[PDB]
Write a protein that binds this ligand. Structure first.
Ligand SMILES: COC(=O)N1CCN(c2ccc(F)cc2)CC1
Lengths: 412, 412
């Protein structure tokens, strides 16, 4: 029957730091990781900024020889995965390697790589495509390369569900453990979509903030002056472990994963419904899955992308699910500070949610200077809010009307 | 315990036909779908042939306007998905729509969209990138578009596990139903990579047959003259359904999905281990999952890609798992006729495994003129073999060393 699942390891690259502690410090200090982009010439683009991972040294993890063959999203994926596994203290052996799997996902995967090889193809010809183009770019090779480097012979897969990838990856890996297909899973996501095709593609859709003259103030979830999301790079990985397995080896347990919801909206290709019906359905599924009174929820880490329609849908969804308790809980968007890591968003935000539970503090929504009409909940404007948090929830929504919710609680 | 899952609907686009019955006629006739690729300059490429979908009319499924927003791989996915639902006779209602979900995947995704948008970026600049570039290319849009068109509000996601995508998608969708997260799932995969980036990318790794003079003979799994796989396009979708739900509405049941195995090789980025250790573990996991002894297996639809290392590893795996039963079961590669649909291979081969059960016939491995060293199993060379089939296995092995097996059983 269904086993319990706990978090024993976390690892991260974000626009706020090259690990979990440095990233978390920036979160609690209300620091922005958003800055004009330096690694390409964007003068022709309507958005010229984002959340870059600054000063990443892949040779803390991999040989220059392997690193050259791999897209940054894979580099980032492996880095966060390696941190998470080291943080777990788990030893892989012949006795358990078949019970340890990996589900690290991406929205877009190796876009930089695909663009460069496409440029080689069109400017030169097919003879200049890297032999490493396919295994160095396709989304499933975070899971692939992690398994090859650590000897993980458990279930090995990747989700790709756009901005919901990291939440779904973590949720489905928990179900793997819950139902006994594995005892340990490394799960999360990674993204590096900051190339011509990425900023150009989101810019053509007019989805991005164009606040080029003040990048740190661009991402302003629930602010009346918000004008689209801010594109950010990075990775989140968690070690999910069956509870008896973690007890047996004396693992440090961060939190328990008690709840997971997915629901399709079936509303629109890219627009979330104004009334927040898909988020509501998803959160209700997750709270029922967790066997909770919705009044037990202390903290929500919102999707909070800084889009006009996305942000207000989330208020509606929370007011609908929590009724008067919507005024008691605290909800914030860490995207105020990190921007939108797309398929990695759920993964870093799952980690921030778990740390909200460890340290008993609601991360702020920075830049929330003029809350929009109906944005009247405790959104932890401007400053971190110490408070009791027994149950934390992390929401994600994506293109295709895809929804995910994760429910974490403090573990005794 | 656990609910039983049956197949009540199938849908397909392949190099052999625009639906299942046409495709299946081709399979049982030993027809090749492989031909020089038309409407494209492949002069500079070392491979100029593959399995294209011939004569596909997207306007049977979508408005010209909706189709123009979507990569071919998405059009192919929706085509198979729409056929499979229609085939099932399922009616979506306000009463069941939250119990019906989708997991349609892709290994490689939107190469044709990448090519066309890159063409515009490089020649004209980012202002010529399509506004639909991102939502029209992301792998989860077959799941998203299907769920929005039909009002499906169950689990909405997509897997990307390279050449294992179709097998994993179907398997994990079956788990969703077995553990009561959904009553119905549309699952499978789609792919359109037989284009410049795909031929180039796989060509660069010398993964492709270069037998340009005899395209129909290029795919020759376990033949001593094989020289790599044949790149092919298309899609498979199954309607998976809890048995009591299928019986209550009077559904036509093709077969029962009894077993799903996963494993990672944790061996190499592209090369299988020579003994097929990972494929062996995966097939053993899937048989344990089904509660079946290896001796009950009558037919295996092999991965059988026509690569030197791949075909031989699968012989090793089968001999290892099946011992003295390895020569009694019939094992064939339909890739001998279809080529390799990458992430859709496991979807179309799951359908061929099911129809092997309905029609009591092992599809041929065509082109097996000179079995290689060790290749002494019943590989159904040249001609379809009528025989007893109670239990069918479908295998998929992909980059990252990611493995999937599905076990289907006759239902009566
Ligand atoms: C070899 O190519 C790949 O593996 N691909 C194909 C392109 N894909 C994609 C996804 C989202 C998007 F907005 C733009 C492109 C996913 C990665």
């Amino acid at each position: 029957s269904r086993r319990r699942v706990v978090i024993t390891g976390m690892g991260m690259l974000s626009p706020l730091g090259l690990d979990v502690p440095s990233s978390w410090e920036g979160i609690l200090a209300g620091r922005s990781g958003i800055a004009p982009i330096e690694h390409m010439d964007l003068s022709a683009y309507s958005t010229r900024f984002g959340g870059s991972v600054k000063g990443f040294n892949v040779e803390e993890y991999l040989s220059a020889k392997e690193a050259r063959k791999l897209d940054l999203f894979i580099q980032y994926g492996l880095a966060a995965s390696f941190q998470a596994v080291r943080d777990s203290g788990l030893e892989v052996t012949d006795a358990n390697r078949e019970r340890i799997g990996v589900s690290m996902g991406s929205g877009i995967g190796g876009l930089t790589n695909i663009e460069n090889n496409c440029r080689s193809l069109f400017e030169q010809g097919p003879r200049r495509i890297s032999p490493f183009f396919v295994p160095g770019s396709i989304i499933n090779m975070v899971s692939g390369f992690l398994s090859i480097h650590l000897g993980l012979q458990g279930p090995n897969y990747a989700l790709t569900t756009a901005q919901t990838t990291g939440t779904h990856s973590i949720g489905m890996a928990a179900r793997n453990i819950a139902y006994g297909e594995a005892d340990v899973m490394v799960a999360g996501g990674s993204e590096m979509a900051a190339c011509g095709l990425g900023l150009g593609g989101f810019g053509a859709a007019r989805a991005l903030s164009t606040r080029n003259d003040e990048p740190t103030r661009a991402s302003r979830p629930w602010d009346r002056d918000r004008d689209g999301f801010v594109l950010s790079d990075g990775s989140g990985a968690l070690v999910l472990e069956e509870l008896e397995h973690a007890r047996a080896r004396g693992a440090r347990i961060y939190a328990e994963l008690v709840g997971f919801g997915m629901s399709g909206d079936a509303f629109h290709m890219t627009a979330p419904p104004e009334d927040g019906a898909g988020a509501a359905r998803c959160m209700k599924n997750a709270l029922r899955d967790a066997g909770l009174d919705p009044r037990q929820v202390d903290y929500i880490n919102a999707h909070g992308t800084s889009t006009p329609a996305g942000d207000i849908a989330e208020i509606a969804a929370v007011k609908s699910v929590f009724g008067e308790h919507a005024h008691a809980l605290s909800m914030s968007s860490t995207k105020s500070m990190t921007g939108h890591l797309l398929g990695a968003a759920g993964a870093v935000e799952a980690i921030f949610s778990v740390l909200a539970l460890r340290d008993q503090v609601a991360p702020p929504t920075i830049n929330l200077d003029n809350p929009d009409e109906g944005c009247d909940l405790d959104l932890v404007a401007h400053e971190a809010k110490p408070r009791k948090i027994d149950v934390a929830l992390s929401n994600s929504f994506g293109f295709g009307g895809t929804n995910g919710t994760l429910v974490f609680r403090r573990f005794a």
